[PDB]
């Protein structure tokens, strides 16, 4: 006898046996170089040219330099909010480096390194955090909600996981247009608990979309450890359930991250099929500036750091030295401080920008609200911070 059910393809079994989840021994973690920067398996070595590996190193450390500066700025109340990328710099640059420049990116908020690798100007990162006249976002969103149409980085929004099924629709449209394009979608392990993640993963598989799902599993969603987030073998183990090709990689190894991403882009585009990459990492800094992470929890910053590990790699190749490290540290700092000071000195956008872009055109009833404000300021203007805004 052979099973005839339309919902599944299987054989009958005659004994009652529950399928047990494999958690103690989960999906292994793909690694390319050890914690001392040594390649473990010559056949997995990407052999990236020197210029590209240096670009990886400089993008990571530059991001790091910007994070320190902007984090202090927030502490001083110069900007109202901030979120660093400590410990996850490798997942950003390694995956971005594996993409084509026109692959469309959807993210969460801890992916600024993708933009950095894509040469997003320091002046724009800061324009957005200060909400000044140079922000193409027109100062409307909270700091670190970056976006760039020119570098194919969809504007970041606060609601967790909403970008996931959006990314899938974007990939579906990409498939129809027949471009050699893949869409990549980043999100944390906490965000993976939202209903939208389940929606996106399932639509991606059943609608056959060229998309790479990229989960950064850093062990925490603010104060919640993964033991309270899920009970299966992480995020990677859910991919096959949706019929999605999956893999887990050491998120502190830019080369393992790069190899996995490069291979998933290649197959996703050719086979119009989704791939799931779960990068194991560790959140070094606080969740944000409104969180003191030492309320619910040094090994990961001193003995297993993506920047530190790529550094050892460069040394062994004769590609970097203590002197170059010093010069780059100094130049990084200067570049960041130049952009920072220019950003603080620029005025904020014209208060009228509060009314545009709600709809493409501006509805008549909305223009009347705009005129209302203009009249209000004519009369009570002395009570508003008018001198700081553009006119």
């Amino acid at each position: 006898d052979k099973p005839q059910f339309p919902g599944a393809s299987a054989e009958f079994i005659d004994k009652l046996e529950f399928i047990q989840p494999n958690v103690i021994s989960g999906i292994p973690i793909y690694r390319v170089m050890d914690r001392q920067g040594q390649i473990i398996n010559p056949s997995e070595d990407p052999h990236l040219p020197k210029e590209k590996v240096l670009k990886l190193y400089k993008s990571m450390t530059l991001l790091n330099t910007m994070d320190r500066i902007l984090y202090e700025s927030q502490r001083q109340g110069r900007i109202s909010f901030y979120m660093t990328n400590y410990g996850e710099e490798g997942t950003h640059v390694g995956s971005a480096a594996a993409l084509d420049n026109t692959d469309l990116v959807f993210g969460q908020y801890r992916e600024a390194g993708v933009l950095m690798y894509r040469d997003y100007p320091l002046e724009l990162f800061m324009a957005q955090c200060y909400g000044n006249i140079s922000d193409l976002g027109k100062g409307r969103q909270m700091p670190v909600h970056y976006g760039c149409k020119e570098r194919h980085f969809v504007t970041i929004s606060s609601p967790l996981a909403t970008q996931i099924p959006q990314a899938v629709g974007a990939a579906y449209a990409a498939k129809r247009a027949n471009a050699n394009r893949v869409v990549i979608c980043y999100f944390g392990e906490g965000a993976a608990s939202e209903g939208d993640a389940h929606a996106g993963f399932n639509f991606a598989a059943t609608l056959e979309c060229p998309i790479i799902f990229f989960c950064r599993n850093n062990g925490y969603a603010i104060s919640t450890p993964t033991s309270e987030q899920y009970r299966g073998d992480g995020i990677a183990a859910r991919g096959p359930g949706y019929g999605i090709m999956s893999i887990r990689v050491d998120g502190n190894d830019v080369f393992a991250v790069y190899n996995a991403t490069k291979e998933a882009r290649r197959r996703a585009v050719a086979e119009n099929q989704p791939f799931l990459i779960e990068a194991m990492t560790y959140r070094i800094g606080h969740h944000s500036t409104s969180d003191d992470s030492s309320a619910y929890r040094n090994y990961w910053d001193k003995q297993d750091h993506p920047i530190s590990r790529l550094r050892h790699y460069l040394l062994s190749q004769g590609w970097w030295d203590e002197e170059q490290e010093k010069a780059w540290r100094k130049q990084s700092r200067r570049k960041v401080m130049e952009a920072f000071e220019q950003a603080e000195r620029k005025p904020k956008p014209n208060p009228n920008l509060l009314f545009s872009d709600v709809y493409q055109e501006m509805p008549a009833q909305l223009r009347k609200q705009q005129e209302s404000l203009a009249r209000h300021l004519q009369t009570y203007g002395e009570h508003y911070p008018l001198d700081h805004f553009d006119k």
């Binding site: 469309l104 922000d135 193409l136 976002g137 027109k138 409307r140 969103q141 909600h145 976006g147 760039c148 149409k149 969809v154 504007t155 929004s157 609601p159 909403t162 996931i164 099924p165 959006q166 990314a167 899938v168 629709g169 974007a170 990939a171 579906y172 449209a173 990409a174 129809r176 247009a177 209903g195 939208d196 389940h198 929606a199 996106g200 399932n202 639509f203 059943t206 609608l207 545009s356 872009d357 709600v358 709809y359 493409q360 055109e361 509805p363 008549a364 009833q365 909305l366």
Partner: protein
């Protein structure tokens, strides 16, 4: 039957569901990027609105999605973000709530928050709407007011086959995410002449379907047919001249047309199937009161569904039928 139903080149008799199919057909025909998707649209849809479209345009343009509303809207926003036209279907307006977050926090704010670097303007969401005599709690809802409080989206509701096709083609072509509610009770009842080629009816424009001088009656969807009859009752039994207006677009709404009408008549009655508290009639009422205070001769009247969930066996006593609207009109005319 709680209601009674009643230039552009060659026309053809079409009921409401057929006029939707005609609109979707014209759109796909003239927009290579346009795709239609949702639960069960491939075989033609549970209300037959997509019959024949997949065979004519291909399975990659007219397809079924997995059963997940938040997914359907998120997926649609994604397609629109690349500039392609996305027409998503939500099977019953009652089931649009799981996608509420994608609609209010995402679609509506997409252009604003990005400084116009990105948008999902080419997105349209169509969904059956309104009572059907026996739909009870989840096959009868009129959720327009929940969306009226959301800057960034448009909500449009037609009253007939001709109006539906023209309003839907404008929604599909508008550069803002749109929600189009189709009165499911009219799908097969309402039948009239409809241009077979594309035409548009503008958004945010109410339509005065009957001029009057004693009172202004405002409604939308099937309810426009109810007040039309109420206007006839008023004339026959009270010698009252009624000005009947179809709002058509919930937001942004045609404030001017309504005010201009009330400035002339001086009396207003607003009617809708949805529950009274928080329904859209409140917005219309408080606004008219602010623009026409000196012209108002009597308090503005709102004849709506009661503040309870939509019932099965009690439907006949729940809806704001012609007798209920007539009585309120009567009392208001006598203020």
């Amino acid at each position: 039957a709680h209601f009674t139903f009643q230039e552009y080149g060659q026309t053809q008799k079409m009921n409401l569901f057929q006029s939707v199919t005609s609109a979707l057909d014209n759109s796909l025909a003239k927009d290579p990027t346009a795709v239609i998707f949702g639960e069960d649209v491939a075989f033609g849809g549970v209300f037959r609105c997509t019959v024949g479209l997949r065979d004519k345009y291909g399975k990659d343009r007219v397809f079924n999605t997995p059963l997940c509303e938040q997914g359907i809207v998120g997926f649609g926003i994604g397609i629109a973000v690349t500039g392609a036209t996305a027409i998503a279907e939500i099977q019953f307006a009652d089931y649009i709530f799981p996608a509420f977050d994608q609609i209010v926090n995402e679609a509506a704010k997409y252009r604003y928050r990005s400084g116009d670097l990105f948008n999902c303007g080419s997105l349209t969401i169509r969904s059956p709407w309104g009572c059907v005599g026996h739909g009870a709690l989840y096959a009868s809802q009129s959720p327009e007011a929940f969306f009226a409080h959301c800057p960034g989206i448009k909500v449009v509701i037609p009253r007939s086959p001709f109006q539906a096709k023209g309003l839907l083609l404008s929604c599909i072509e508008d550069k803002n995410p749109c929600i189009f509610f189709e009165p499911k009770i009219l799908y097969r009842a309402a039948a009239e002449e409809v241009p077979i080629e594309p035409y548009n009816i503008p958004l945010s424009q109410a339509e005065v379907i009957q001029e009057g001088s004693d009172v202004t009656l405002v409604a939308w969807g099937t309810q426009v047919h109810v007040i039309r009859e109420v206007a006839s009752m008023a004339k026959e039994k009270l010698g009252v001249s009624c000005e009947v207006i179809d709002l058509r677009t919930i937001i942004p709404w045609d404030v001017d047309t309504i005010c201009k009408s009330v400035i002339k008549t001086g009396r207003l009655l607003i009617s809708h199937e949805a529950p009274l508290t928080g329904g859209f009639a409140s917005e219309i009422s408080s606004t008219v009161q602010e623009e026409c205070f000196l012209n108002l001769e009597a308090p503005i009247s709102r004849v709506c569904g009661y503040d309870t969930p939509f019932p099965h066996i009690f439907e006949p006593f729940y809806i704001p039928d012609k007798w209920k609207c007539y009585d309120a009109l009567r009392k208001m005319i006598n203020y």
